[PDB]
RNA sequence: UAUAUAAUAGAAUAAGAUAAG
RNA sequence: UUUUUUUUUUUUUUUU
């Protein structure tokens, strides 16, 4: 199909939209790909907005920064700054999220000194899309992040917001950090006087966002807690899951709420997949509730289906249960002998999680223990002192005993001494480490060790 | 020294430009071209032994 | 052709030192007559294009840098002229920052950081410009939307100065570039047009057009050289090229001209010789046309037919203007009508979320689209954009 | 499976190997199970591979267009100001030590880019090399790209292929290269024997030893060296060919044949292809990794996993 | 930072006046002060303007001397940024203190925007 | 069409009005969110934009900046605003950011003792009429004069002086013009007087008249392109059926608590009229307007 | 008596969960 | 539902 770069860039933004919120269809997938592969916008010359609906387009269906129209679209992003108006910001700049080059950097701090010096001439649209675009790059510009806040809090206060720009933003303000109590007292606000305009598939989102920010204030979730009471009835898996998620996160003890949680939960249990079972659990094992029952029952699921587990679902269930104590003989094996297929998918804590959990369960398999020992070897970098002396202390009752191995944890250790032998808790830990191992295994931290710091 | 021969292939398009030894000659001439010529020659004589050739082919009768 | 295929194989490895004026020789020889199968043979314009990369495109003008990478794109490799550098210290003459200028513009690649580094270098040697090289630079920088408004009033205000060193080209290429930059004073856009109605006599029709799209762009609030310039040019009403009649209608519909004297013969004009008119042209025409009130029996009748010629590959974006017209006016255009809904069915592929809504729009009460075909299909696609409107 | 978020759900996975067919860059999808009968090649090419120990295709692989979007991704591979992302997927590079050299030369490259990973599934290149390993399945290798530098590119010595992979048991290989620019006895077109493939009965000769601080002269006289009486009369009858390849042309070679590369002296940089192909019944020698952070095989364990993808399967 | 309707409303007003009494005591002692710029002294008097605060006359015409020594660079020297706007607000304060503090600073602030010298925002 | 208003600063808003009237500030923010709601539903508004809160209750006054006087945007004399400066350049920085004009036309800020007061022009017909009294002396009026009166055929733009006595507000407050030739005035002496004023003035022309009570602030958006609605205050119901009977559209808007403020609805909006730029003889797309297809 | 020139523009449009200090 | 915003800041004493 032969089409000019806007024409190009039309269809290839409606594709994103198709493949994006109306099903994850391959076939888009890779038309989309093989279109853009062979555009160029070398000679043709565009409107800034046609550049960067492609640039996004093409960032989008991963094509990386090596690319010549993603390097193409950059040059024109920092040449023509000019022409980057508020409209066709947050495309660039959600665009340059991914992109770790120094260009997109410079692309990314540009735009963020443009959008913080006139921030207060924005509309609801503008400001949504930016302080949203803004989200995803990492970004750390609190400045920036003030004076957006502050321009919603005056924009709020005339009731212009709504549902999905209310849901947007707050999940923007709190993957940010950013602990403004008056700011998600104003989003509340203007929540509660949008009567019967925020739908349950509005609400949820609001709520685990509100739980994941961390509001100090408790009177807050009490209204969120009755709201989700009235509206219990409405909803799938999904939601019961997201909410149990939520209101694990903020930490209040509620009674019917989560009674009629459980029911519903219970009602759906034949359309619980991997990942609501695992956020269950952890959610149960945040708020310490106990349910036997509904573990029994979500334990018999997770059996059921076993293919669907990734990573972090494997994680979180086997530290779920192996905190709450009840636990599976062959639901145990079957996952343990799943994660050694997909070894080489766990992230550097997730590894150190899942290890710990099968070795704190006196759960010892001989694959699962050698897939895990030899992964651990690619991710030791990325450890915090506690989470190194957990692997350790898991690859200790492992019996490993591999130098391979051992001497990147030791070294991981050594590097960290000051947090690794200062740990409140974990003596008992270290103490049956250095037991299992000997002096003779590692000098240097055995003299460390005793002289108690 | 193709530099040379591709002047004089210009000179006598130059002179057919306002046809025996006219379209005859320029042909012999280009196709005097040795290996070692061919091979030390630099920009500008393969610029002008190029529109020579394409001219002469222009006006020639089959070849080019 | 012995010698013919040694100089080709010689060429592709990239064993010849080609110069930049070579390439340029190549390129034209290759362009114009062709006899060799120059183009057609894709491993020699491969190796010349390697050799024209790395070479040293210094010595050669924008325009030849510019038929060379055409040439190149014609088969199908992605070349672009280098980016030249600002000049240093010593080579800082009013006569190389125009030429920086005009290579950015000409190339149709523009920096701002070097746009904005040749206007400081230009300021403190900004006294030494010859009167022709403040009407180029004006130009230039209009040209490149650039957004620096004093530079070009300086500029303007110079250019003032010097009046009778100027041609009337030159005075009217400065008043169309001056009403193009956004930002500039008015009291410099008063005395600009102040100075070309005085020197308004000697214009030429490409002068009337560049004066015409400079009224144009700055709006109702310049009524009196509009009608200055209406007022002379009766005399050449009859003997006027289409293009600039058609201007005077777009100027006329802007003003909002209340003399509507002299808009009937500009319009009967306009009407005998549209024949001569492109998509743009004719479009622009009927809007302005239909803007002031002129849409008659007859001459509506023969805008129509000058439309049906064009009608059946109209771009997207002529389609909902000719509809909307055709919509307000109570004459018959059922022959056009159709022809258009055709081409727009045609066109549905492409159509983007505004123009399509405004096509639906148009044919909402329209009693013929109720059994046309393009119902569904447009339903379909609205269906498939309504992510995008 | 997980949650992944709304502006990510169209990324690709960090290693290229994750993704278990092709993509559709380069040419458009692989064709149907039963469409794969256009690619094959004549016998006569079959029986001169056997004969030669190599062979050119009779027409080019890859259309020029995809030629060019091949070369520019190994200039972007080379970049040296700004380093190529998904570096650390490579098996090996030149620029490790960020400083480069004259030649340029890349391992692993189809974990760490588009294009490139479309090429080990060309259907034109892997139905030949099924072809040529007595109709088998086929199981990519690895991959290698060289570029020379634009004037002092460095010509590679004599060498054999084998030499290196002692890994792998039975001598079942291929290689396929092809280049992306045009290549002659000045620019690096390849140098092999004519018959070297079936000398010793299989076996290896010894390495040669080069010095790297002089010309081509005695790089390419080295063979004499490293030769034997009877091998120099084999080799004076049919001495050594240069074989010139133009854009995409593909160039089978067993793995025995001794070949060299010539230095470039163009005015310009060249870049150039290689991909081995296994076949089936290939197996390990030694215990642990055949490729820097692969998977760990046993002492004679059938290679086989998502570092060594399935190319082509006939039946 | 003082509310007319909050908790203290009432205690309101002598706080403002507190302060005003605070501006007073920088508001005698600013004529020893250099300005390097226009903006510091537009700054200044606005804050100055806005509370009321009262300043000597002595102060005003130290302070609107160095302005007019200041904008007396950017127009005759020409060769070198006030733009519009900030004279047009030097002016208006000239005019609200007088013109007999300054003679010359006003028919200069005339004379420049009749010239157009200062730029615009826009630019 | 664009409606430019400013948000009120809570914190400080006055306890008592400038008479002695006390005011609440929550109706007042609540009065401030129906006015925001009701002029965004004006379906002839293409945007509404709504500027940041400044330190200052006067700033609410956003319409004492500028005049809209032909396809001019002339801007009022600094001479007792002096504390307003950096809010007009504000203003003007909110104006630049919508895509309306760059700067603002300065041709009463240099003319000599040059007094004026927006409000106290207002359009009318091809023309526009001034009101002479304590704020606008006769020379901002000469000046006024000078820029806009012609006097020729087919192009007329006349100005009328209107002569006010020395205790009324300004005369936009007052008289103003609505739909197709329709007036409207409160009933009381200045209204009464100014009608007469312009009936000797446009003698030969017959106009729709409608008196309304006393102190009922009102908003028209009068102009080229016809609108029928007209914003009212609620608390009078005699000037909504006066208007209603007239054949416009009343819209009741509760303005309370800038009553007792002294801020009228006229002095609290900025309506503005931006044209795009046309480049090379275009013609952009205009609004939908009329009945497509009359005769089917 | 010489080997060579290259400039016309149009479109207003919002997707939404990272095991934190 | 009433808390907050508008500088050219440049002065940290290590041998890493």
Redesign the interface.
Known sequence: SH?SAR?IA?EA??M???????G?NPML??????VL??T?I??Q?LDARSVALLLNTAV?????????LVRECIDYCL????LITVDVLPIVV?AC??LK???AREVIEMQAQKAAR?A??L?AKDVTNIISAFS?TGINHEKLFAFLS??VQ??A????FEAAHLVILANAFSRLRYRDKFLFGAIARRAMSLRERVTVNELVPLIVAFSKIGLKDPKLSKRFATKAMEYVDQMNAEQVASMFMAFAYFGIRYDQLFGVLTNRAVELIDEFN??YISTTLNAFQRIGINNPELFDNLAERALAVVQ?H?A??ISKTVTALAHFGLKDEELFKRLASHAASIADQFDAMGLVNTAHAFARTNFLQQDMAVALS?RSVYVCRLLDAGETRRLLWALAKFQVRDPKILTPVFNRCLALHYDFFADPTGSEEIEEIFDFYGPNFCPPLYQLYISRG | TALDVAMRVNKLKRLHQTKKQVELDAWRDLNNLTEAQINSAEGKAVSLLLNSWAYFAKYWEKGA | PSALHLIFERCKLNLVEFTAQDVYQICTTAYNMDTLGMLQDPDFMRGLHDAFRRSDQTVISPFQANLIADTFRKVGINSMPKEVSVPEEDAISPESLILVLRNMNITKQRDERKINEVLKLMFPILDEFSPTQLSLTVTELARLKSTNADFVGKLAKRIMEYNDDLSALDISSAAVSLAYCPGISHNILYRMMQIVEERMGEFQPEDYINVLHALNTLGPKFVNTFRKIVECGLQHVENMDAVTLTNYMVCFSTMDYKQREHIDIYADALVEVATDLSEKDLVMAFIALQRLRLLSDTMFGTMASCVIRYAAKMDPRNIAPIMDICSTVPHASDHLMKVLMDRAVECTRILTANQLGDILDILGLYPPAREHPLVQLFGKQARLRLDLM | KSYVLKFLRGQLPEDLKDVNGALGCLYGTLPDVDEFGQFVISPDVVNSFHQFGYVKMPIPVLDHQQIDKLADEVNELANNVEHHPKTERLYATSLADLTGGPLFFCQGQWRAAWGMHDLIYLPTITVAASQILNNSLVRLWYDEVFMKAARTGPCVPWQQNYARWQHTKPVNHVTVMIALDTMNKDRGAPCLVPGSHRWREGGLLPPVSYDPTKDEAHQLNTIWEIINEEEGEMLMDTPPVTVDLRRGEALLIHPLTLFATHGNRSLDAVRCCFIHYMGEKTYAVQNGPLLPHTTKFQADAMIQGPFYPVVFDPA | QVSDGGRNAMNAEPTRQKLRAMGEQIGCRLDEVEYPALPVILSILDVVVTLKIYVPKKCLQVIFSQANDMVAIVMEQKDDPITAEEGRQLQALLSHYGNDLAPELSQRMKEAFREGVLPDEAS | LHAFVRSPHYRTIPSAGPNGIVVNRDMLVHQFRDFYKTLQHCSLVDKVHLMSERPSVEALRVADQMVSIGATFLEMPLTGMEHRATEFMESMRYVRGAGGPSTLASYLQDTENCRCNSGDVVCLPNGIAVGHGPRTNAVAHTTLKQLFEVKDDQFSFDVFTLEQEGDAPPLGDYFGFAGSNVLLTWKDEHGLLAVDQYQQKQPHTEMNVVYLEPGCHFLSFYGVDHTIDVLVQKGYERSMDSIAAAGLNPIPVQWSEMDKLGISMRAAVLPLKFFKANVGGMLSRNKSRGARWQTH
């Not at chain 1, 206060?157 to 212009?160: A, L």
Request: proline share 0%; hydrophobic share 25%; glycine share 6%.
């Open positions: 089409l024409n039309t933004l409606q994103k939209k198709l493949h994006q919120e109306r994850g997938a890779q038309q989309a790909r093989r592969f062979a160029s070398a000679g010359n989008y269906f991963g094509m990386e920064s090596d690319a010549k040449k023509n700054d000019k959600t999220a991914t080059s120094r260009d006139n207060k001439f509309d995803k502050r321009r005056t924009l206060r005339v009731g212009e991997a990942q669907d990734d972090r679902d030899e």
